[PDB]
Amino acid sequence: SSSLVSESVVSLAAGTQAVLRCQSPRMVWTQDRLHDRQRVVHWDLSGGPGSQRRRLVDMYSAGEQRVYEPRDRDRLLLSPSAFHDGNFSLLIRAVDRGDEGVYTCNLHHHYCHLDESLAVRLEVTEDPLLSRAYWDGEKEVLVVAHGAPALMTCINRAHVWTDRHLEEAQQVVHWDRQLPGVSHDRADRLLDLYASGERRAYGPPFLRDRVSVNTNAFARGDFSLRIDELERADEGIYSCHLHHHYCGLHERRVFHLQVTEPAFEPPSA
Amino acid sequence: SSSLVSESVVSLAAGTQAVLRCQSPRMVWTQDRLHDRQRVVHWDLSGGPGSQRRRLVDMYSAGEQRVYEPRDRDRLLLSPSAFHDGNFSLLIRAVDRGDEGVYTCNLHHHYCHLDESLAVRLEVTEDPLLSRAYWDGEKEVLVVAHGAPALMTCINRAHVWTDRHLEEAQQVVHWDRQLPGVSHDRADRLLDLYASGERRAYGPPFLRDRVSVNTNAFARGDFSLRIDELERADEGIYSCHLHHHYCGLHERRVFHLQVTEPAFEPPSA
Amino acid sequence: NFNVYKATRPYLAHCPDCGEGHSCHSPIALERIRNEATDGTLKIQVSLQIGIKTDDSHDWTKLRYMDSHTPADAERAGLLVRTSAPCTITGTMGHFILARCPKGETLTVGFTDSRKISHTCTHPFHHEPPVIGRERFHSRPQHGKELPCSTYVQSTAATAEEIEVHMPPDTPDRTLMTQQSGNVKITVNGQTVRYKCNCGGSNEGLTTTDKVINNCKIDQCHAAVTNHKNWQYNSPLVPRNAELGDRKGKIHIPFPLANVTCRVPKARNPTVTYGKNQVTMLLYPDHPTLLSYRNMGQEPNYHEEWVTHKKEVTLTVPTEGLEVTWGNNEPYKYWPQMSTNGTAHGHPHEIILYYYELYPTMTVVIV
Amino acid sequence: EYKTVIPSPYVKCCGTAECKDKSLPDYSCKVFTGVYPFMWGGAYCFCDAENTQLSEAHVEKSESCKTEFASAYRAHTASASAKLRVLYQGNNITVAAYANGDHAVTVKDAKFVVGPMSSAWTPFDNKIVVYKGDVYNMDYPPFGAGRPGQFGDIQSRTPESKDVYANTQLVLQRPAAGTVHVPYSQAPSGFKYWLKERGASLQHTAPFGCQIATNPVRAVNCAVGNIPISIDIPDAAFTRVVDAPSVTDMSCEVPACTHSSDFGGVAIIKYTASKKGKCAVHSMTNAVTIREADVEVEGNSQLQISFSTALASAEFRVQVCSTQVHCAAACHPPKDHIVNYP
Amino acid sequence: ANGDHAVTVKDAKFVVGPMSSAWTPFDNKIVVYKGDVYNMDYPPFGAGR
Amino acid sequence: YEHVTVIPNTVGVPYKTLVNRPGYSPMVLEMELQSVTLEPTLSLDYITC
């Protein structure tokens, strides 16, 4: 399926060229494996709204975690196989007053450009029997005794976070056309665009000559339909369908193209 | 989403003729539309397990009610437009002591050969304050004062019983084949049997020459395929699909055809 | 998550050229090679199961293997696939190895098990990737044409392919019986053991305990641990379940093929010069590339060759033009002309040289 | 590509098993008597003396057939189609019509009919074999008559059929001493071999410079013969002679002429126009060609035209707006011998 | 029946044709309706009467 | 042994063919046509309605 992004009605004059804009930074891919399968997990430390977040430790997919402060070495620890079940939890071997603050567990996909985060408030007390982890309504709160370890759990069992296959190969753009009178599901496919570069045009040769997409479509994430020499046979309900099945993006944009109206027309959305 | 009817594995010897059994009395139909849109309502009266039931009143779809007792004419009434909204309730103008017993409302559709019934026990008192309507756990019981009218509700708003297009026109039986190793959904269409009698076979001549169903298949509700001169290309998973989209009948039978076991075969299920 | 290997066993086989002069019984024994990709990768059917623990976990750093009726565990970084160099391993799953590997006449596999021994074995395999386009090259270039090609994708639960896994027959071990001066001491090692003897009393049957069998030697009898509780697949290097056809099982073979687009290097643009009626052309090759030419008249007169060194060749252009292509780049058209010098409208005869320029070898015949 | 499925050999210990005819393409079975296989603990079965080995093998389709396959097509006649750019009323219009002689296309009231091709020549023979980009003229063996090790050794009718025809010359041999394995003889693949001794494709060898593309298969720009074109021009485009300007006493001077592919002729024509307006300049002799359609005449001014010719001394008559002008030119040979455009 | 189809049944190879006569009852232009075919020189596309 | 024969294009007419292989008893094969199908080239020019 897909989700409706934006609607517009397009009224253009006969003899002109229609350009139906369909752009998205989330459909960008390139004809090279520019570390798309590379993800990053990182723990950040802040101390309220009036402090600067500091990157504490991060870890690339299929890699080892890197900590930025030599003092924190062998003290802030992640599971080395964190990407197998999605347990991105951080164990602090021995805590001090300098560790108090909000820790955010941030997952980031460099290819999908998604970020997800959770917060935990760390406060260091002196009594170990008061040490607890609880949910204050929107975040976990850690009370930790001095010198005790603190295991802040960060578990994300989504398939994108665990070491599944995670390269789709079949990001696809569809250009669909809904003619007057045709019921749904029987809409004619106009154009198939695979992220790998393949394009598929449908219809008799006389029609294929009039339907085109820019040659660097996936390079800029621009799949705008250009149809030269607008005819009444170009009228209908067009839909751009972006499908990234593995990362769960399924969106469509709808364009009502009518070619029966001169330069007096008002734009929508 | 098709309900399974019965599942079997069939093993027969090479060189013999296969008979793939697919039978159903509920798929019987003929070329003609002879009273297809015919339903019947009938109310029955009983008086416990040790008395003989008597049919009281019946009515055909788009027709008027027939009463069997001359005294009860113009006294026992159904709505003449009962079949438009599925309001098959029965209004009896005035009750008496002889009317006590269990009344059953029966709807029957002659094309799907469906019958559905519910019972209500009518008991006639003399005091109006003892009159109540309750559900005993499996049937409604109506307590009615003597001489008052009784509206016994029988409402079934299912699409098969209401007055709407109610014309099938496209029941289809499908014969499918799932080749060994080849997964489902990309299965080759083998046979289409349309309610009108037309069949559609696909494939090269080597396959079409051997696949047939008797010409009165849907007339007798027997869709067994007889395949002469069994070849290895006939082995696989066959599926007979009866589709009645209107009556909500969607059934299939699945056959694992293996070639082995000439007279020693165990007939599965 | 994708755990269908829950009852198979990473069986041990007989590898027919284990190196060091002779064959062996080995767990690592590859059986079937797949090379159907155009671009030059290899898919390997091996006798192991990789990335699965003995409790069928998703521990993707270990590997199961059979040795002496034991499914034991080693680790994933010990693998080496080789033909003439270490091949670049890409995809490890079960009986299935996906790797990319340079030119070589053989193929061996080898790795370190849990007892620190690099078991290695090979097969002959004339591995040569086919040419793509018109070029023989070395590495993936900067820029080139985008030709269709085929490769194996790293998905796992792909249906529409099957192999049949089943019950193992037996395994004869003569490491069981010991001679007690005419007796034998059959052990069981917590299993189900078949014996068969040329020995009165206990000649046939199936024992479950340790036995002492009187007045008949070790080699007079038989000993074979009969597994029943797990699965092996039908190998053509394993004896069958020795009564009839295979017990039914189900394992799909993962990592299917797909179309893909792959870059091929462009040619180096050659240097041309133009002589009277004809062309001369020096080419700059760096890896062996073919060159072809035809004309566009009635007949093709088609010629071609591969080249490796820099050559300067001449080509006669006819009046109907010439076409020459070189590398992946565009076919070069060429057309003749009404020459640099002739003899213009002059006081001497001074037409006939001109009357060669149009129409050589003819129309001087009507002179 | 085919796949030879060889299951586990049926070892019949101290007795003789017999394989029956189990129908499969190129089904091969051989029972070898007197075999003595060696296993982990010696001979696999204790009853040593009469062991026999039942070897079974069969060929089936590979999964790669769904991706990697070659198709044999029968090509008989081609439907010709053309794209024409027309400078009509000062504007470039593109028309797409079937060059078969029965496809009238009307654009801006102008009816176009490209006729039937004068020559019925086609570079394709009756039998074609296609592998995605390249197509070959090859006399493939008929269906059910393939030869081993050559193109057509394994044949199926469609990529999803289940029955298949095979001729691979599979004959099973007696296994070696002690080792348990299933030896089988030679089995080359004709499809995988054809990809090496394939030769030049039709893309490079076809005459007349035909460029062939696939998906669907087509021959582009085959320079063969001529083509008739009929134009039913409407009457709004025409202007009467009186409404057009009258020009008179025209003279032509040729300061430079070179018979070449490029703009080698330049002519300055002095004229006298009665009024302002457009004019169609045209050469009445086919041996010289004018590369300008419309000229704006004003009055007692001069026009410059560019012409291309093959004649060295071009004596030709030019009709402008129904008035005749004689032009006498002399042209020199060019400096260059090879041009990249015809 | 083209002379280009070998069929093996019970080890017997049958190859049939090619037909000696290339005659066909159809002309170059035909028009087909529901179950009827007519040999008709239909008007070309874009030039109807 | 390859036997080449020619029969007339008549359906429903049984033809006898004599196979005479030297050193073997002669064999007569009976031939019966069922149908001869001529599938013409399908190129849709246009539709009318």
Ligand SMILES: *[C@@H]1O[C@H](CO)[C@@H](O)[C@H](O)[C@H]1NC(C)=O
């Ligand atoms: C997550 O990892 C921590 C160690 O960082 C471990 O103690 C904890 O048990 C893990 N969670 C689960 C559910 O296994």
Ligand SMILES: *[C@@H]1O[C@H](CO)[C@@H](O)[C@H](O)[C@H]1NC(C)=O
């Ligand atoms: C059914 O019909 C009766 C009249 O025949 C009417 O009184 C009753 O309200 C109807 N039922 C419903 C649910 O409206």
Ligand SMILES: *[C@@H]1O[C@H](CO)[C@@H](O)[C@H](O)[C@H]1NC(C)=O
């Ligand atoms: C790849 O593309 C070709 C082009 O038609 C097609 O034949 C093949 O089936 C495709 N393969 C996949 C896996 O999509």
Ligand SMILES: *[C@@H]1O[C@H](CO)[C@@H](O)[C@H](O)[C@H]1NC(C)=O
């Ligand atoms: C028509 O196309 C040709 C192609 O080069 C060009 O030279 C000419 O200027 C075009 N005419 C107009 C009016 O654009």
Ligand SMILES: *[C@@H]1O[C@H](CO)[C@@H](O)[C@H](O)[C@H]1NC(C)=O
């Ligand atoms: C019958 O109707 C179906 C659907 O309306 C259509 O596709 C088909 O072409 C028709 N066939 C004939 C012979 O009219």
